[PDB]
Structures are given as C-alpha cells and as structure tokens.
Design a protein around this ligand. Structure first.
Ligand SMILES: CCCCCCCCCCCCCCCCCC(=O)OC[C@H](COP(=O)([O-])OCC(O)COP(=O)([O-])OC[C@@H](COC(=O)CCCCCCCCCCCCCCCCC)OC(=O)CCCCCCCCCCCCCCCCC)OC(=O)CCCCCCCCCCCCCCCCC
Ligand SMILES: CCCCCCCCCCCCCCCCCC(=O)OC[C@H](COP(=O)([O-])OCC(O)COP(=O)([O-])OC[C@@H](COC(=O)CCCCCCCCCCCCCCCCC)OC(=O)CCCCCCCCCCCCCCCCC)OC(=O)CCCCCCCCCCCCCCCCC
Ligand SMILES: COC1=C(OC)C(=O)C(C/C=C(/C)CC/C=C(\C)CC/C=C(\C)CC/C=C(\C)CC/C=C(/C)CC/C=C(\C)CC/C=C(\C)CC/C=C(/C)CC/C=C(\C)CCC=C(C)C)=C(C)C1=O
Ligand SMILES: COC1=C(OC)C(=O)C(C/C=C(\C)CC/C=C(/C)CC/C=C(\C)CC/C=C(\C)CC/C=C(/C)CC/C=C(\C)CC/C=C(/C)CC/C=C(\C)CC/C=C(\C)CCC=C(C)C)=C(C)C1=O
Ligand SMILES: COC1=C(OC)C(=O)C(C/C=C(\C)CC/C=C(/C)CC/C=C(\C)CC/C=C(\C)CC/C=C(\C)CC/C=C(\C)CC/C=C(\C)CC/C=C(\C)CC/C=C(\C)CCC=C(C)C)=C(C)C1=O
Ligand SMILES: CCCCCCCCCCCCCCCCC[C@@H](O)O[C@H](CO[C@H](O)CCCCCCCCCCCCCCC)COP(=O)(O)OCC[N+](C)(C)C
Ligand SMILES: CCCCCCCC/C=C\CCCCCCCC(=O)OC[C@H](COP(=O)(O)OCCN)OC(=O)CCCCCCC/C=C\CCCCCCCC
Ligand SMILES: CCCCCCCCCCCCCCCCCC(=O)OC[C@H](COP(=O)(O)OCCN)OC(=O)CCCCCCCCCCCCCCCCC
Ligand code: HEM
Ligand code: HEM
Lengths: 80, 106, 379, 62, 52
C-alpha cells in the first residue's frame, strides 16, 4: 500500500540505491518475510531487547516517570 | 552609636552570615526559612518568575548536599548582594492574621 | 493489565509503606537508624522467644535454668548473648534516633514526636523487667531499689509498692509477674511502632537542610532498600563483634552470683543505658524531689516543641545552637560517668552541677540563643 | 582484564535468571566447603599443639 | 475446564518447559544443600569429603 503512487516509488528507488546499492524487489521481500517464525522472532527480540540499557526522553509533566533504575530493571524478568 | 558602631554591628552580622553556610550552596536567606502556614500563603502570592527561581535554587542545593559537595568560591552568595524578596509578602500576611485575631477577641 | 500491587488490599499497604512512598533524596545516614531499631526489635523477639523455651521463672530455678541454657542447651550461649547485647544496641540506636530529631528539628511533627516518647517509656520498662529475669545479685537489688522508690508518693506509695511486689518483699511472685510483662510488652511496642509510621506517612520524612523536598523526592525501594541493607550489615558487624570476642564487657560482673537477700553489695548501679537518670535522682536531697526530677526531665522532651522559637527548622545553619547541642551531649556523658562511681564529695558536686546545667540548658539557654540568632539575621 | 571471560559467563549463565540462581546454589555449596576447610586449617595452625585433636593421640588406644 | 485447550496453550507450555526444568533443578539442589542430605551428597566428588 505504501508504494501506491509515483512519488513513493521514486523515493524508494533513491533511498535504496543510496542505502543498499540496489532496489530489493517485492518478490524478495515476500520471500524473506515468509522465513519469519515465532522461534525466529523470540531469538532476535532477545538479541536486541532483553536486558539492554535503554535511552529515555521525557518532555512535559513527568513527575511520575520512574527513575532510570526502575526502568532498567523492567527490561528483564525474574521469572524467566 | 551612629556611624561608629553601626558599621561595627554590620561586621558581626556579616560574620554570622558567613558562619551559616547556606551561601556556599547558593541559597539565599529567604529560601532557608521554615515553611509554616504563613510562609506557604506568602509563597502562593509570589510572581511566577521569582517562584521558579526559588524552586531551582532549592533543587540545586538538595542535589549538591546529596553529593556532599559545595559550590566554588566564585559562585557563593554575598552578604551585600542578597535580595530579601520574600519579606513584603510575609509581613502583609502576618499583619492580616494579627488583625483577624484582634477583631476575634472582642 | 495493570500491576497487581496497586489492586490487592494487602499489596496496597506494602506498596504505600515500603515500595513507592516518596522520600527526600538527600537524607543522610542518620535517617537509617529508624529502620535498624525495628530490625533490632525483630531480632530481640526471636532470640528471646527461644530463650523462653527453656527459662523457668521461679526464685530458685531461674538461675539454674540460665546456667543450663548456657552449657547444656545447643547454641544456648550464643542466643543469650545476642539477646543481652542486642538490648544495648537497641538503646544506642534509640538514643541516636532521638538525637537526630533534636538536631534536625524533626520534633516539629508533633503527632509523630509524641508517639515516640511513649515508645521510649515502654522500651525502658521492657528492658528493666528483663534485667530482673536472670535473678542475679545485681538483678535482685536493682529491682529492690528502683521499686522502694515509690514509697515517696504522697499517700498511696506504700500501698502501691506491696501490690506490685505481691507481698512484703521481692520474691518469686514478682519474678513470674515480671516475666509475663516482659513477654507481652514488646508486642505492644510493635503495634505502637505502626502508629508511629502511620502518623509519619501522612506528612513525609524530613531532610537535613530543613527545607521541604517536594521538588526532589525519590521512590524508596531501589535506593534506600540497598542503603538500609548496608546499614543492617554494619549493625550486624557491631553486634557480632561484641558477642563473639568480648561478650561481657558491657555487662556488670557480680550478676553471676546467686541472689542473696541478706547481702547488700557495696556498689549497686543500674545498667549503662539507665545511668544518666540514676545520677539525676541521687543528687536531689529529697527522696520525693528526686522522683519529681527524674520525671520532669524525661518530659522536657515533650516540651521541646513549645520552647522552639527559632525561624529555621534545622540547626545546620545555627552555629551557636550546635555548640550548645554538643555541650549538652557532653553533659549527658558526664552524667553517665558519675552514675557508675561511688558516693563521695567530688562526684556528688559534679553530679549536682551537671543536673542543673542539663536542665537550665534545655529551658533558658537554648530559647535565648535562638532569639539572638534570629535578631542577628534581621528577620 | 579477561573481558572475554566475563563475556562468556554472561552469555551462558547470567542472561537468564533461572541459570543465574542455579550457579549461585552450586557456588555456595562449593564455597562453604572450601571456606570451612581453609578457616579451620588456619585456626589449627595458630593454636598448634593445644587443641585436644593435637594431643588425643597420646591417650586414644593408649 | 475446557477453555485451557487449543493449539496455542500447548505452545505456551512448550516455551516455558526449559524454565520449569531449571527452576525445579534449583529447588532440588537447594533442598539437598540446606538439609545436608548425606544420601545424595555422598556421590559428590569434593563435597563428600565434609562427611568426617
Ligand atoms: C498485618 C495486619 C494488617 C492490618 C491492617 C490495618 C490497617 C488497614 C488500613 O490501613 O487500610 C485498609 C482498609 C481500607 O483501606 P484504607 O482505610 O483506605 O487505608 C489504606 C491506605 O493504604 C493507608 O495509607 P498508608 O499506607 O499510608 O498507611 C500505612 C499504615 C496502615 O495502617 C496501619 O497499619 C496502622 C494500624 C495501627 C495498629 C495499632 C493500633 C493500636 C496501637 O501502616 C503503616 O504505618 C506502615 C506499617 C509498616 C508495616 C507494613 C506491613 C504490611 C504487610 O482499612 C480497613 O478498614 C481495614 C481495618 C483492619 C483492622 C480492623 C480492626 C478492627 C478492631
Ligand atoms: C526438612 C526436614 C529435614 C529432616 C531430616 C534432616 C536430617 C536427615 C535425617 O534425619 O536422616 C534422614 C535422611 C538421611 O540424612 P543424613 O544426612 O544421613 O542424617 C543426618 C542426621 O540429621 C544426623 O543426625 P545427628 O543425631 O547425628 O545430629 C543432630 C541432627 C539431627 O537433628 C535433626 O534432624 C532436626 C530435624 C528438624 C527438621 C524440621 C525443621 C522444620 C520443621 O541435627 C543437626 O545436626 C542439623 C541437621 C538437621 C536439619 C537442620 C536443617 C533443617 C533446615 O535425611 C533425609 O532424607 C533428608 C530429608 C530431606 C528431604 C525430604 C524427604 C521427605 C520425602
Ligand atoms: C536509676 O534507676 C532507674 C532506672 O534504671 C534502673 C530506669 O530505667 C527508670 C525508668 C523507669 C523504668 C522501667 C520504669 C518506668 C515505667 C513507666 C513510666 C511507665 C509505666 C507503664 C508500663 C509497663 C506500661 C506502659 C504502657 C503501655 C502500652 C500503654 C500505652 C498503649 C497504647 C496503644 C498506646 C496508645 C496511645 C494512643 C491512642 C494516644 C494517641 C496520641 C498520642 C501520642 C498523641 C500525643 C497527645 C497529646 C496531648 C500530647 C501533645 C501535646 C501538645 C501540644 C502540648 C505540649 C506538651 C507539653 C507537656 C508542653 C527509673 C525511673 C529509675 O529510677
Ligand atoms: C528508612 O525507611 C524505612 C521506612 O520509612 C519509609 C519504614 O517505614 C520501615 C518499616 C519499619 C520497620 C521494620 C520498623 C519496625 C516496624 C514495623 C511495622 C513492624 C513491627 C514488628 C512487629 C509485629 C514484629 C514482627 C515479628 C517478629 C520477631 C516475629 C515474631 C512472630 C512470629 C510468627 C515469628 C516466627 C516464629 C517462628 C516459626 C517459631 C520458630 C519455630 C520453628 C520451626 C518451630 C515451630 C513449631 C511450631 C508452631 C509447631 C506447632 C505444632 C502443633 C499444633 C502440633 C500439631 C500436631 C499434629 C499431630 C497436627 C523501614 C524498615 C525503612 O527502612
Ligand atoms: C458484626 O459486625 C461487626 C464487624 O463486621 C461488620 C466488625 O468488623 C467488628 C470489628 C471489631 C471486632 C471483632 C472487635 C475485635 C477485633 C479484633 C482483631 C480482635 C483484637 C483483640 C485484641 C488486641 C486483644 C485485646 C486485649 C489484649 C492484649 C490484652 C489487654 C490487657 C493487657 C496488656 C493488660 C492491661 C493491664 C492490666 C490487667 C492491669 C494489670 C497490670 C498492672 C498495673 C501492671 C503492673 C506493673 C508493671 C509492668 C510495672 C511497670 C513499671 C515498672 C517496673 C517500674 C516503674 C518505676 C518505678 C520507680 C517503680 C465488630 C465489633 C462487629 O460487630
Ligand atoms: C533468613 C534471614 C535472612 C537474613 C538476611 C540478612 C542479610 C544482611 C545483608 C543484606 C545484603 C543486601 C544485598 C543482598 C543481595 C545483593 C544483590 C541484590 O541486591 O541484587 C538483586 C538480587 O536479585 C536476585 O539475584 C535475582 C535472582 C534470584 C536469585 C535467588 C537465589 C536464591 C538462593 C537460595 C535458594 C534457597 C532455596 C532453599 C530451598 C529449601 C538483583 O540483582 P540484579 O543483578 O539486578 O538481577 C539481574 C538478573 N539477571 C542477572 C538475570 C539479569
Ligand atoms: C544518653 C547518653 C548519650 C551519650 C553519647 C554522646 C555521643 C557520642 C557521639 C555523638 C555523635 C558523634 C558523631 C557525629 C560527630 C560530628 O560532630 O559530625 C559533624 C556533624 C555536623 O554536620 P551538620 O551540621 O549536620 O552538616 C552536615 C553537612 N555539612 O554532626 C551531625 O550532623 C550530628 C547530627 C546529630 C546526630 C546525633 C549526634 C549524637 C547525639 C547524642 C545524644 C543526643 C541527645 C539524646 C537526648 C535523649 C537522651 C535520652
Ligand atoms: C536485603 C533486601 C534488599 C536487597 C535484595 C532485594 C532487591 O534487591 O530488590 C530488587 C530485586 C530485583 O528486582 P528489580 O530488578 O529491582 O525489579 C523487578 C524485576 N524487573 O528484587 C528481589 O527481591 C530479588 C530477591 C528475590 C528474588
Ligand atoms: C522505639 C522504636 C522506634 C521505631 C521502630 C521508630 C521508627 C521510625 C522510622 C522507621 C522512622 C522513619 C525513618 C527514620 O527516621 O529513620 C521514624 C521517624 C521518626 N521518629 Fe521514630 N521510631 C522509634 C522511636 C522513636 C522515638 C523514641 C522518638 C522520639 C522522639 C521518635 C521520633 C521520630 C521522629 C520525630 C521521626 C520523624 C523523622 C523525620 O521526619 O525525618 N521515634 N521512626
Ligand atoms: C525490645 C525487646 C526486648 C528487650 C529490649 C529485651 C531485653 C532483655 C534484657 C536486657 C535481658 C537481660 C538479659 C541478661 O542480662 O542476661 C533480657 C532477658 C530475657 N528476655 Fe528479653 N528483651 C526483649 C524481648 C524479649 C522477648 C520478646 C522475649 C520472649 C518472648 C524475651 C525473653 C527474655 C528471657 C527469657 C530472658 C532471660 C535471659 C537471661 O536471663 O539471660 N525478651 N531481655
């Protein structure tokens, strides 16, 4: 749906040629997506999300925002 | 005792101001007062800019005391530059309270 | 789904009381002695509980049972010394708890400050009755003297001393009666300790500067749980060193002899934590007057909030008040030292001077200096 | 600075808390054995020749 | 109970099985350690020495 229209198509060509050096076709995208499985998602999410130090930004009434230590302690599970 | 001891009296007053270290944390004299109902009412009347500055100074002073440090001498508060911004509001509040009590006893 | 700790009834109280109540970020180690006191209370119960499984409250078998616990019962000796030395650590923390309030102005929290006074009086009662349980030479005579000092009450004294005794002397009925009171009282103290926290929680804790800290509050759990854990480790270090190396330094020998009714030891003295009061009563020439002094004193602690006339809560910015505070602390040290010395001309005059100096400091000197300090700042 | 050693310890035994707890239990079991044995040896050394263990041989089976 | 069945509740059990085994192992070792159970402990290469 995003590729609908001329302008989005041109943007994809330019950004891909400066990013990958090529333009990944839709067929390739579908093939890579089909390879995804629940187990694959678990491993990748664990690789990047679990027990990693986050970066936080807050602009407003933020008196209730939990301190970094509490935020950092919520990135893992004591049950796991 | 005019122009012969008032300058001497100012001297002892300055000595006590330095003995009290709240200047070393950047705190002004008025910020240090105990906050009772009268003080709370007075603070309510302060303009926004004065109130915001007072809040930041208190926050910074708490932060410094947490670390067990003090400001550099260059940033200490002086005994000839301090403003008594809170005095007018406290004075008016006390006067109003006394008036109410005086009327209320008769 | 929201966290269950904000919906379960039992978890709401735990979350409010421990996990998430805002606290000042800058509170120093002085604010760590309150949690230790309760921990010590907990420690004092369990140890005593096990001792109660073997102690026999009778005039004859009380001393024998203690010897049996120390030698035959497995690990009985260590339990007894933890109980004995934990008492002293409790009072040390208690005095430091009170001292912090006087210096940083915590007494302004009237409701919380008044409840504290009751906890102190109850604690002293528990400790005094416990010291009678060993039924040694010092225990028998300590109770005898500290009880005969109610015959000065105008007209009911003599009637209200035999009633406490359960007889015309101090014998087994007193021992059993004190045993029950010793057991029960600490649990009441535990309940009162929950009223202390409750009245505190509705206003929040104080900070060393004396200024309100709403701008820089912090969740209690991570920061202060580990900080209080560190304090507990240090407290355990002190307690174990006392028990495991020199258990009996802080006790008074001659308590290891069977109580002899017809043998007055040459030098009767209370326990180290009670000495300060003993000298305040031994100095006043009148027997009734000495009791009125020991009481009027403890209660000046209740009068401190009235005598306060400074315009600053914390004595941190009050250098002259600091000098008086340390002077008063030195006076208490002198009173303690005199308490342990025999009656004689030099100690008596020193004790008399210390007593008057103690009182006049609290009453006149402190208010007057606060007024002068206020005048100096041009309030 | 055995950064690789710490990296291996984390990736295998600390990433999941279940393994974290298991290592703790085995470690304390081994630690108490070693700690007790070493401490008792030190105590015996400082008090050589006085403990009954050091003089019982003169009376046992004798 | 009938709602607990289905293709996915089976999957959830499968994922958590490794964690369940580890927690069970932790408890078993902890119990043995706390109780100083000679029966199992006698087959430990180094700990057995404690026993005289
Ligand atoms: C264990 C026994 C638990 C008993 C709970 C009694 C308190 C119930 C309560 O506070 O509200 C719950 C409940 C409804 O909630 P709420 O009244 O709106 O207040 C809850 C807030 O979180 C209350 O606000 P809060 O969280 O700020 O108040 C804290 C206060 C909560 O209140 C108390 O605990 C004070 C009770 C004083 C007992 C001693 C009185 C005599 C001395 O406790 C503390 O001060 C801290 C205690 C530290 C240990 C916490 C251990 C938790 C496990 O109140 C009740 O009606 C239950 C009454 C139970 C006792 C009936 C006695 C009949 C005689
Ligand atoms: C948990 C229940 C533990 C009860 C049994 C532990 C002792 C083992 C035993 O008696 O032999 C049976 C058997 C052989 O063990 P052993 O190490 O050759 O015998 C050592 C004797 O304790 C050696 O007895 P002893 O007369 O030569 O020396 C006195 C000994 C004997 O004192 C005791 O056993 C006291 C038992 C109190 C346990 C109940 C406390 C909680 C309620 O007390 C001790 O030295 C401390 C060990 C007792 C356990 C303390 C740690 C409990 C936490 O031990 C077990 O099967 C352990 C049972 C734990 C798995 C539950 C099985 C239920 C199905
Ligand atoms: C040298 O030999 C000596 C020693 O060594 C050996 C000693 O050890 C001692 C020390 C004595 C030691 C043992 C014996 C003394 C024992 C006692 C005095 C006490 C007798 C009692 C005990 C066993 C029983 C203890 C009582 C208990 C549990 C009952 C209390 C039970 C409760 C739940 C508590 C409930 C209270 C509730 C609801 C009230 C709630 C409110 C409050 C605190 C709020 C405060 C309210 C107020 C009015 C006060 C506020 C005031 C204000 C503004 C005015 C200011 C006040 C002024 C005064 C100015 C002595 C004397 C001695 O000689
Ligand atoms: C600085 O910031 C902080 C704050 O400000 C933000 C705070 O506010 C606080 C919170 C304040 C504190 C702790 C301070 C104190 C305040 C408190 C609320 C808590 C008050 C304390 C108490 C009531 C005391 C609590 C308890 C204590 C010591 C325990 C006593 C009672 C018990 C149950 C304990 C257990 C004893 C046990 C089990 C006995 C041991 C024996 C066991 C195995 C053998 C037992 C055997 C049996 C019963 C056998 C029975 C057999 C039977 C019937 C036979 C059956 C036979 C059959 C055949 C069926 C903190 C810490 C803080 O840091
Ligand atoms: C049907 O609808 C309803 C509901 O649902 C809709 C409800 O929910 C409720 C809710 C309420 C309830 C059910 C009510 C009950 C609720 C509960 C949880 C039950 C709780 C029960 C309790 C705490 C028990 C209360 C009793 C207790 C602990 C015991 C009380 C007594 C004492 C400690 C002893 C007091 C003193 C006594 C006898 C005096 C004798 C002793 C002395 C003078 C002391 C002697 C001296 C000494 C210690 C010496 C001290 C001094 C010394 C040494 C020296 C002093 C100095 C000198 C110088 C000498 C209701 C009513 C209801 O209807
Ligand atoms: C009974 C009387 C007890 C008295 C105790 C007195 C204690 C006095 C001294 C107080 C010391 C306070 C500090 C003690 C712990 C310090 C470390 C602690 O604060 O850290 C926390 C400790 O948390 C726990 O470690 C979490 C795991 C739970 C481990 C439980 C081990 C239980 C062992 C004993 C089991 C016994 C079983 C017996 C069965 C019969 C969080 O660690 P963290 O680094 O942030 O977790 C990250 C998790 N990762 C690694 C997976 C990413
Ligand atoms: C009863 C008998 C009691 C006898 C014990 C006498 C005392 C032994 C030790 C006294 C405390 C020693 C440690 C403190 C030493 C010291 O002076 O440290 C300096 C430091 C000054 O720093 P601040 O002005 O707060 O500013 C901080 C950031 N700039 O000291 C303090 O802060 C002290 C604060 C009070 C803590 C308690 C002090 C000890 C009090 C003892 C008794 C107090 C009265 C008890 C009355 C009731 C008695 C039943
Ligand atoms: C002594 C008491 C204080 C020290 C031990 C308790 C403690 O450290 O509390 C934090 C600990 C870990 O929990 P935490 O990481 O803070 O957050 C929840 C997980 N997302 O929570 C724990 O209680 C860990 C120990 C029990 C498991
Ligand atoms: C005897 C057992 C006692 C226990 C278990 C206890 C417990 C506590 C605790 C946990 C706190 C908060 C944390 C802290 O201040 O360290 C506190 C605060 C306080 N305690 Fe106690 N207390 C006891 C006795 C006393 C006594 C005898 C007094 C006498 C004055 C007292 C007066 C106060 C005051 C005024 C505060 C407020 C502190 C503040 O606002 O910063 N308490 N208590
Ligand atoms: C704050 C709480 C407590 C304090 C301050 C306290 C204090 C004392 C003291 C100072 C002694 C004298 C011990 C000695 O001189 O050797 C003692 C003895 C004793 N107390 Fe405690 N106690 C407390 C709680 C308890 C509890 C809860 C129990 C029982 C449930 C208990 C039971 C005993 C027993 C059995 C003795 C006799 C031990 C002996 O003779 O050495 N105590 N207590």
């Amino acid at each position: 749906s995003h590729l609908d229209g001329t302008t989005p198509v041109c943007e994809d060509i330019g950004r891909s040629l400066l990013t990958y050096g090529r333009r990944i076709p839709l067929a390739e995208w579908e093939s890579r997506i089909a390879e995804v499985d629940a187990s694959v998602v678990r491993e990748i999410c664990s690789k990047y999300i679990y027990d990693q130090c986050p970066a936080v930004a807050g602009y407003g009434p933020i008196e209730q925002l939990p301190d970094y230590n509490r935020i950092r302690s919520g990135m893992f599970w004591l049950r796991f | 005792a005019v122009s012969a001891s008032g300058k001497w009296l100012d001297g002892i007053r300055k000595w006590y101001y330095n003995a009290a270290g709240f200047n070393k944390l950047g705190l002004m004299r008025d910020d240090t007062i105990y906050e009772d109902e009268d003080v709370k009412e007075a603070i309510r009347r302060l303009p926004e800019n004065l109130y915001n500055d007072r809040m930041f100074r208190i926050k910074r002073a708490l932060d410094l005391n947490l670390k067990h440090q003090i400001l550099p001498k260059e940033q200490w508060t002086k005994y000839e530059e301090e403003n008594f911004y809170l005095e007018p509001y406290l004075k008016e509040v006390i006067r109003e309270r006394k008036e109410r009590e005086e009327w209320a006893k008769k | 789904m929201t966290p269950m700790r904000k919906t379960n009834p039992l978890m709401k109280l735990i979350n409010h009381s421990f996990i998430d109540l805002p606290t000042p970020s800058n509170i120093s180690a002085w604010w760590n002695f309150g949690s230790l006191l309760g921990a010590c209370l907990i420690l004092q119960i369990t140890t005593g509980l096990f001792l109660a499984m073997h102690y026999s409250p009778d005039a004859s078998t009380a001393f024998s049972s203690i010897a049996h616990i120390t030698r035959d019962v497995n690990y009985g000796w260590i339990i007894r010394y933890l109980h004995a030395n934990g008492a002293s650590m409790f009072f040390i923390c208690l005095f430091l708890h009170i001292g912090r309030g006087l210096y940083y102005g915590s007494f302004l929290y009237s409701e919380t400050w008044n409840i504290g006074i009751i906890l102190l009086l109850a604690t002293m009662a528990t400790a005094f009755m416990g010291y009678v349980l060993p039924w040694g030479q010092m225990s028998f005579w300590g109770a005898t003297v500290i009880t005969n000092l109610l015959s000065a009450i105008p007209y009911i004294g003599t009637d209200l001393v035999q009633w406490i005794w359960g007889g015309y002397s101090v014998d087994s009925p007193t021992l059993t009666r004190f045993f029950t009171f010793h057991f029960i009282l600490p649990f009441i103290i535990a309940a009162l300790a929950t009223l202390h926290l409750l009245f505190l929680h509705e206003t929040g804790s104080n900070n060393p500067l004396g200024i309100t800290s709403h701008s820089d509050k912090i969740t209690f759990h991570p920061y202060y749980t580990i900080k209080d854990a560190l304090g507990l480790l240090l407290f355990l270090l002190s307690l174990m060193t006392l028990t495991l190396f020199s258990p009996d330094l802080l006790g008074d020998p001659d308590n290891y002899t069977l109580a002899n009714p017809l043998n007055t030891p040459p030098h009767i003295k209370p326990e180290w934590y009670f000495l300060f009061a003993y000298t305040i009563l031994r100095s006043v020439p009148n027997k009734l007057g000495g009791v009125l002094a020991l009481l009027l004193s403890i209660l000046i602690l209740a009068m401190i909030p009235i005598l306060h006339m400074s315009k600053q809560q914390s004595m941190m910015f009050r250098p002259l008040s600091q000098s008086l505070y340390w002077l008063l602390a030195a006076d208490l040290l002198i009173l303690t030292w005199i308490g342990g010395q025999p009656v004689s001309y030099p100690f008596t005059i020193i004790g008399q001077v210390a007593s008057v100096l103690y009182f006049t400091t609290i009453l006149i000197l402190m208010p007057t200096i606060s007024l002068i300090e206020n005048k100096m700042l041009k309030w | 600075a055995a950064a690789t050693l710490t990296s291996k310890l984390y990736s295998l035994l600390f990433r999941r808390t279940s393994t974290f707890a298991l290592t703790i239990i085995v470690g304390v079991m081994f630690f108490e054995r070693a700690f007790d044995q070493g401490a008792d040896a030190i105590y015996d050394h400082i008090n050589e020749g006085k403990l009954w263990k050091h003089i019982k041989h003169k009376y046992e089976n004798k | 109970v009938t709602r607990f069945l289905g293709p996915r509740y089976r999957e959830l059990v499968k994922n958590w099985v490794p964690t369940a085994y580890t927690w069970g192992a932790v408890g078993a070792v902890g119990l043995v350690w706390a109780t100083d159970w000679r029966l199992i402990l006698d087959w430990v290469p180094y700990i057995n020495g404690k026993f005289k």
